């Protein structure tokens, strides 16, 4: 009965890793697809106002038709506060979930690499 | 020792998460 | 070609915007292999699925 309790209590942990991880993955897509809507909602506004994507998006970044304050449509939103997708807010989107339940020292703490990692890549 | 020892960890990742 | 691509970099008859083909792509960017870039087009498959 007891190697029955440890090895139950492995799976556990093992089965909470795996659904800790779906769930990360699913909730960083999520958020993902919900910041380039609303940019490419901000960059439709943009090109109905006039100004054809600035200059140029890849190079670097340069002038436009007008610099800011141009509408009040633009400035409402202008893509999350001129585009800042700051580390911080992506960690509250990923953790405002996660810490519901079944979760310990070895849940996010380690999950913070995958964060920093997903982070680098953009 | 074992126990807010190492929850201090916890504290420390709440206080990042805000 | 310019003058020579493996030993060193050098001048060329005209410097830039030559024509709005080349200013079209320029290679991505004046040859710009930025790991950046890279790192997103492999990833953009790999973390899909099967990951940790």
């Keep these: 009965a007891f190697t029955r309790e440890q090895r139950d ?15 990360i ?9 919900s910041r380039q809507a609303q940019s490419e909602i901000m ?7 006039g100004m054809p994507t600035d200059d140029q998006g890849m190079p670097d970044m340069s002038r436009a038709s007008q610099d800011q304050l141009d ?18 807010e992506r960690r509250n989107a990923v953790l405002k979930s996660l810490v519901d ?18 982070e680098s890549l953009e």
């Design 43 to 49: 960059r439709i506004v943009g090109k109905e106002v």
């Design 25 to 33: 993955a699913t909730t960083f897509q999520d958020y993902d697809e």
């Design 9 to 23: 209590e492995l799976r556990r942990d093992r089965d909470e890793a795996k659904l800790v991880s779906g769930t």
């Design 101 to 118: 339940a079944g979760v310990s020292s070895k849940g996010i703490a380690q999950a913070k690499q995958e964060m920093e990692l997903r």
């Design 71 to 88: 509408a009040f449509s633009n400035a409402l939103n202008e893509a999350g506060v001129q585009a800042n997708t700051s580390p911080t």
